[PDB]
């Protein structure tokens, strides 16, 4: 039933955000970029400093405190790794609809325990950890992405990489297509959102006419994305999909991994109708010409 929280991925101008780790260096910086971008940031939390004001916004000690006062519906986490998993738990307790954890370096065991509880509920949706965040171009920015390269458009972007996502964003704007919703699911093995979750939203979003998927070598995420598309994106109103897999030129202990891709990830995506761009600088042109091949311009 955790899939019921997928819808909370689609932030908008009405989303009310709070920052966990508000007074922290990273929390202050990105909280300021968020305000300048127009994001409805209504405060944040740092233990021991509740009540005072920070960046002209109220500071709280707990997440439930900030939520009851500001009616926040989304939370962004910049807490250090040793306490980030607990920061996620605190938000799930408060039943924050959307939680975006930017922090990198959370122990896998910690996230395994968090994800154990996350899957037994459907009120909170987690993005990350170790992700750039989510952004509705022009309406809401919850993350670390540079806002100036985005622009509300027609291409839904999902990326397992960090900075590499910005190349797909910058290119879709220069070609005049823009982005409808950009999501970075992060690069950790145990996370709250995967490729299929974002694809489900893109395929059912009218504003999303094209889709770009950013991947890379390692794991099975790209393959699972292919199988999902081959079933639900092949047929009547098939939306065009483009992808790039980093590490084509990357170089390659135990028997566990072999028991339980690069070349194969590409072959799998193509089988589901995905046009894979071999160059990281041709994501915008490829999706553009695909729109041209479908009279979608």
């Amino acid at each position: 039933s955790y899939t019921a929280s997928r819808k909370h991925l689609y932030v908008d101008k009405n989303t009310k955000v709070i920052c966990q780790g508000f007074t922290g260096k990273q929390g202050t910086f990105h909280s300021q970029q968020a305000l300048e971008y127009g994001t409805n940031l209504v405060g944040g939390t740092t233990p021991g400093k509740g009540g005072k004001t920070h960046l002209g916004l109220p500071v709280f000690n707990t997440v439930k405190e900030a939520k009851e006062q500001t009616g926040a519906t989304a939370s962004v986490i910049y807490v250090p790794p040793p306490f980030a998993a607990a920061a996620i738990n605190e938000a799930i307790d408060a039943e924050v609809p959307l939680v975006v954890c930017i922090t990198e370096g959370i122990p896998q065991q910690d996230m395994v325990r968090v994800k154990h509880r996350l899957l037994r509920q459907g009120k909170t949706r987690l993005i990350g950890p170790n992700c750039p965040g989510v952004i509705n171009p022009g309406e809401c920015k919850i993350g670390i992405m540079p806002g100036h390269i985005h622009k509300k458009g027609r291409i839904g972007i999902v990326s397992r990489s960090g900075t590499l996502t910005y190349e797909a964003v910058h290119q879709t704007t220069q070609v005049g297509l823009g982005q409808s919703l950009c999501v970075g699911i992060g690069g950790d093995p145990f996370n709250g959102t995967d490729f299929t979750d974002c694809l489900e939203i893109f395929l059912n979003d009218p504003a999303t006419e094209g889709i770009i998927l950013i991947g890379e070598i390692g794991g099975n995420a790209e393959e699972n994305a292919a199988e999902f598309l081959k079933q639900h994106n092949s047929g009547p109103k098939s939306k065009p999909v483009v992808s790039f897999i980093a590490g084509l030129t990357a170089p390659p202990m135990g028997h566990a991994g072999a028991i339980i891709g690069a070349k194969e990830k590409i072959t799998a995506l193509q089988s589901a109708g995905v046009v894979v761009s071999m160059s990281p600088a041709q994501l915008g042109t490829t999706i553009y010409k695909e729109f041209e091949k479908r009279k979608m311009l």
Binding site: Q26, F29, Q33, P81, P82, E104, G105, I106, P107, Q108, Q109, V112, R113, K115, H116, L119, P132, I144, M145, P146, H148, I149, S159, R160, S161, G162, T163, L164, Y166, E167, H170, G187, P189, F190, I214, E216, I217, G219, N220, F244, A246, G247, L248, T249, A250, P251, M253, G254, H255, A256, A258, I259, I260, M278, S279, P280, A281, Q282
Partner: protein, 379 residues
Amino acid sequence: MNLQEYQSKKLMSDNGVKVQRFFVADTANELNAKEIVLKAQILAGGRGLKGGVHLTKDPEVVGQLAKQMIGYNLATKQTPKEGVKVNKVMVAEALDISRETYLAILMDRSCNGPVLVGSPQGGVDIEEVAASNPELIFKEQIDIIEGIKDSQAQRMAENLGFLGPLQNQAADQIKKLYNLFLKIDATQVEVNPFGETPEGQVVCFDAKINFDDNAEFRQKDIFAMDDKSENEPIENEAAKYDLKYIGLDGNIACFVNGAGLAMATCDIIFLNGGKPANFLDLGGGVKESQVYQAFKLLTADPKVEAILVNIFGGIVNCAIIANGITKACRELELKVPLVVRLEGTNVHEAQNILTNSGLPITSAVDLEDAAKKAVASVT
């Protein structure tokens, strides 16, 4: 992070896991063993002069085989085709094996946490039976909250083929391995073969443990054991300033923020005929001392004939990044060219700061442009 066998065996012994009695040496000359086991010590599997592991009955022979191992490379199925230079060897009290079994405990994404993975047909090349007979592989998904239950340990030990008094003995070792797996913040604890001696002792003869890097802040003693000898000196020195270095065979060094972006940088350099020498991921945090050090390491390697700086979305204003490169380059007098691609907050100003400095700095507009400029400057 991965440790040698002798380092994992000691860790397992301290937590009640039955292991062999071992010694480590650096030379062939360097127990009362009825039979001795000689095993090359490398951070790789498939070690089995031909063969990385040998069995003899008394010392003398070990001194003759240890000369053909130490100092030589050992190429296995999971090592680079060149192999891995063998520096240490293990001499341990060899025990007889009635049965070879495979057992592993790992965090698997599909299993949403820990999972026991075993096969009664273990030893040597477990991966064969995995593909051949998928039915010989068994899986017990463990609940991180409830922990490993006695029933699960018994069922796995039963499917691994431990019968009679050995079943409860193996199940107890499985429990101690799972608890160890959690204690040391491991991503993989693999024992192959999970053996069975004729005396009726369940023993872990070999051990391969992968440690979660993210848990180092609470695994100080464990990460202090990392020899770091199997890494290039350039990598270890890069890590001192929180810079992850990865060397390649080329002439164009890369300085990028983001592993995914760095791989794409190497990917697009190939597309234009160039070969990247290295690639130094700067990560999220961007201390203007790192950029200073970054060039020092990238320039140290003689094969570097050009440095490509591709920074997109840095946390710090690109202007501050522009000033760190100019002085860092000026203080050391860079010889090789420098192609710089910056993007982020206040970049229109940041770029002129580069070219209006009188320094050998060529600015790039995008990624495709930066690549072609890099391959062109190495003529």
